[PDB]
Chain length 410, copies 3
């Protein structure tokens, strides 16, 4: 007959036995303070101090750091040899990391050879694109997860408790409930964030940063994912070997010659800027306060000063947790799966959530009806970094160790 | 003077004449049960049984089934003839559904003909790309509409009523109101969902699946919309006829040679996975429960145990409905328009909504102030399938027949 | 010790000293009216008239007008000269605004010259693409900002006040609070809206309208940003000079030949339509009422008929405002920054928001704790047009003049 459930964060109240409600829309980038002495209905001399502090909305974005985007120049060169294969010779652009070579091998001809070359069906002409004058222009991050929150601190008498409350969650105590309800549509999973400078100031949102196909001229075309090594873009155009009697062959390329950075700068007003305050970069995560004062969320504060609220998640069930295994990747939009061994006592069943967390950041959660004794629970998550040890958690309680996920993009 | 309106789903209450409020944030993937005996303020011996069951959030997505995505290999072949036009000969890739042919017709030359060919300005060389080693790798669906809901069941005494309540709608009864408020930003209209296997497990979200231009290497490049017949991608590159004295011409192609499936797999961590539970595929619709336990919505439950709520949509107006005509398409982001003949009696005017529905799924709605007597109301909708008969509906009441819309992509 | 703050829009109430609550989900495209005489608890003969009118949800979109999209035909022509450079001759497509020329200069050859041309390494063959049969097919607008609102009018006794209330903001008066809570996910910043006709009817949403790279065949490929002058698309394909003995060279082009409009029409069901009612176009802004009756928002109305609500933003602080400078652009996703000189009196500090507004439309806001005396406040904004004079505002109070921002896309 009993069916305990702690997935409800909130309270049951009797509207005539509630003493105070605050209900308001609050600028997302503003704090709010409420201070009041709660006094007995002219029917005593014992007041209770109420002090509520709500901090500015923070955004937390789990990301994959994509490294730096580069500007550069596309150069074209020609190399000719009357005799020999194309592997027999070293070309100038061979040291250039990003290059495109077209080999006109065993194709020497009368009206396309230089004067000293009586060759026919021999040798090699080389047309050769390369990127040079490379310069990093910004740091890019792929959005994996977006979560907004406010830190909420409530003092009621001598009770004092602070919690970080996620948007669309509630702070619950015996005498005070604080619920935050909101929506924001500025950032989307999959968006790529570009920071041009030491941009504790702002950046740009790109909705079409190249991923599976990068061609020269695309946003994100020339990337260096770490300190060294480029992920080079494609050059989809064609070469032409321009021929002439007694003259060295000359290469042409008929594709786009303008870098992605220049093309984007040329129409920069087409792209959306965002601003930031009190940034905090950590590995594969960015947190900040968005100072956009046009955005608001809804706050509701309910206070009962005598009889306790009915905490809707109250239960006698007790949970023990340890990790069993993990699969999948950090820094990945596909994510990972953490397998937990979860022991339930003091209840026949318990409907709750088991979370994958590390250092008080949670990356995934699974709702589950546990049965008395041992349970195996798989938790899907996204985010984290190579040093993350994902732990199995219930409420504020976590396993003693966590597990590392695998790296993405291997 | 009267202006009846049933577009408000909710209640008017007197806060001192309300007996119970439940207000909480609930894990989207969790159910919730509340059971209580409501007893008279120590001032009787007559209790009322309250039993509330809230089911897990379901997502319902109206889609267009795009058929299967394929992996494959791009092959290049050459075919030569000394004499004759290019239509006079059958080429090997002619049976290949996806191919690209370049005809070098009437262009035979001394240093590009085989030994047995003294031809000049004659015959034909054929360069010919074709896709082969094709394999379906998944089933794709274009999102047309996304709606979330929870089934809500309320027993109050002997009253017993269950309703599917859409997110941001309310359950309304004489003694109980249940409102659900939430937001989710995981899926977007226009997204394409890819299921790789029998994926009652999960899939991937693609935000840039090719539509008006599919080139080889794009996500969605090789599609078969039904059992047979491919929608073939473009091959944007160039051929080169490589010539040599007394040697057969040899074709080259300088465009991308890597399939979209391989390019996507090569950077799979760039794409967003989602998970599913208790899926239900029907024609052009997918329903499931998202087990992402990080998501929450807000539930409010208000109970008056003695005096009835004021139902804000209460009215004496009576509606009769029939379809008149339809235009437009199912399975289409542009949609359809259903024209309804709507008779109003017992009121001079009535502000309400008329809906286009079939089998208790609604695909569109129009708010309208009806006037006494006959009205013509056009309802815009999206979704459905070739077997859908869109009916004109008001509340839970529908016309006796519905109409079929036209197929998309004709 | 004092810390005044007016960023909270809402009220503090004592649930037993509140007389009426209306809580309901309302069709977004519907109005709502409430009329009632509030009478004293059978304990007087003095009623108060309550009359509430809530208007249909309006959307306001700040945009950049992109001008017209065109359909057209890609034509290819050849021009030959036996002798002379390619600048020495005028080509037919020189008057065509959108063209692609390939010059085969100083490349005359025996098996590629016409009969009257004994030239070798001389003259010029011209292959030349041009767009013609151009026709405007619609007007495009880039979304910069999306905001939804409802006009709310409340009469309480002789008090009468109307306000436009943004979604997720509250109407606040001494006796009545009206809060609107909602979410809509139909439009996104960066989306491009296409109107095909005099489309006070509807349009299409494009999520991938070309910006930094437009190739022929893309949505948005051929644009005229104003009355005259085209932004021409790229032609990424290659020309081929097809040669023959004693015959004039003939050009070919192996890239896409189908316009973006035709490609989009060919798969129009892949794109999302929206409908509109009572449109209002102004420079760089579009407002309308979305008649999609499937969408809803949440309305809460709380009334105290005797004792006033505690207005949570009540304060004695007084603000004076003037503009100091501006940088940045209207019609731009990057936006502008308005610098304001703000004088605070009657308080040591004041937490509030300063806004950049013109003609009662606000384009940006900054939350700030002002200190007594002079303050410099920077407000980031987006939207507006060349005639906008962005003013510094606090609540409904604005500076005497505003400043113009710079044009985008210079
Ligand atoms: C939730 O989904 C994950 C993700 O795996 C799926 O991802 C889809 C995008 C699609 O490619 C589908 O084919 C794929 O299965 C599931 O985890 C995966 O499970 C398979 C089968 O056991 C393993 O082979 C994978 O390694 C594993 N990947 C990860 C990252 O765990 C998962 O089972 C599913 N359900 C739950 C409860 O998490
Ligand atoms: C709501 O919009 C539909 C859709 O039709 C519009 O779609 C836009 C994307 C754009 O292309 C615009 O030019 C187009 O009119 C309207 O329905 C259409 O109405 C026209 C004119 O009568 C008919 O020729 C179409 O066949 C018809 N299409 C459909 C699917 O019904 C509709 O009138 C409009 N208003 C309402 C109330 O639904
Ligand atoms: C909010 O952001 C604006 C925007 O400027 C930033 O935009 C990013 C996309 C990125 O390119 C970054 O490098 C860039 O600084 C800030 O305004 C800019 O500030 C700089 C430095 O003083 C000026 O040179 C720019 O002209 C100016 N632009 C505009 C439009 O004002 C702004 O300082 C920042 N903070 C606030 C409070 O608005
Ligand atoms: K190429
Ligand atoms: K091609
Ligand atoms: K080209
Ligand atoms: Na080419």
């Amino acid at each position: 007959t009993p069916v305990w459930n702690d997935n409800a964060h909130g309270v049951g109240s009797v509207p005539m036995h509630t003493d105070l409600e605050l209900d308001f829309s609050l600028t997302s980038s503003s704090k709010y303070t409420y201070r009041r002495k709660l006094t007995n209905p002219l029917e005593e001399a014992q007041s209770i101090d109420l002090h509520i502090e709500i901090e500015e909305q923070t955004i937390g974005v789990d990301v994959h750091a994509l490294g730096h985007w580069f500007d550069g120049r596309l150069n074209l060169k020609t190399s000719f040899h009357c005799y020999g294969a194309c592997t027999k010779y070293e070309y100038p652009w061979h040291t250039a990391k990003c290059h495109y070579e077209r080999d006109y091998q065993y194709e020497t001809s009368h009206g396309c050879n230089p004067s000293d070359c009586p060759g026919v069906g021999t040798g090699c002409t080389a047309c050769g694109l390369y990127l040079d004058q490379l310069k990093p222009v910004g740091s890019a991050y792929k959005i994996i997860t977006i979560r907004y929150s406010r830190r909420v601190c409530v003092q009621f008498g001598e009770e004092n408790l602070c919690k970080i409350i996620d948007m669309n969650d509630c702070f619950v105590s015996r005498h005070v409930k604080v619920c935050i309800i909101g929506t924001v549509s500025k950032f989307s999973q999959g968006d790529t964030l570009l920071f041009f400078g030491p941009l504790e100031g702002g950046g740009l949102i790109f909705k079409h940063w190249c991923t599976s196909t990068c061609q020269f001229g695309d946003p994100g075309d020339i990337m260096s994912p770490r300190d060294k090594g480029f992920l080079c873009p494609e050059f989809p155009g064609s070469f032409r070997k321009k021929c002439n009697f007694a003259t060295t062959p000359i290469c042409e390329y008929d594709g786009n010659m303008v870098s992605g950075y220049k093309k984007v700068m040329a129409t920069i007003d087409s792209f959306q800027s965002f601003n930031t305050s009190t940034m905090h970069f950590t590995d594969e995560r960015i947190e900040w306060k968005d100072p956009d004062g046009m955005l608001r969320d809804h706050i509701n504060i309910l206070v009962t000063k005598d009889i306790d609220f009915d905490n809707l998640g109250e239960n006698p069930c007790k949970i023990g947790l340890q990790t069993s295994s993990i699969e999948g990747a950090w820094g990945s939009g596909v994510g990972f799966t953490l397998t937990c061994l979860v022991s339930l006592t003091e209840c026949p069943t318990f409907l709750t959530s088991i979370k994958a967390c590390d250092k008080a950041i949670c990356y995934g959660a699974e709702s589950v009806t546990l049965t008395r004794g041992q349970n195996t629970v798989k938790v899907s998550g996204k985010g984290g970094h190579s040093g993350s040890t994902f732990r199995c958690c219930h409420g504020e309680d976590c396993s003693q160790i966590g597990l590392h996920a695998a790296a993405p993009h291997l």
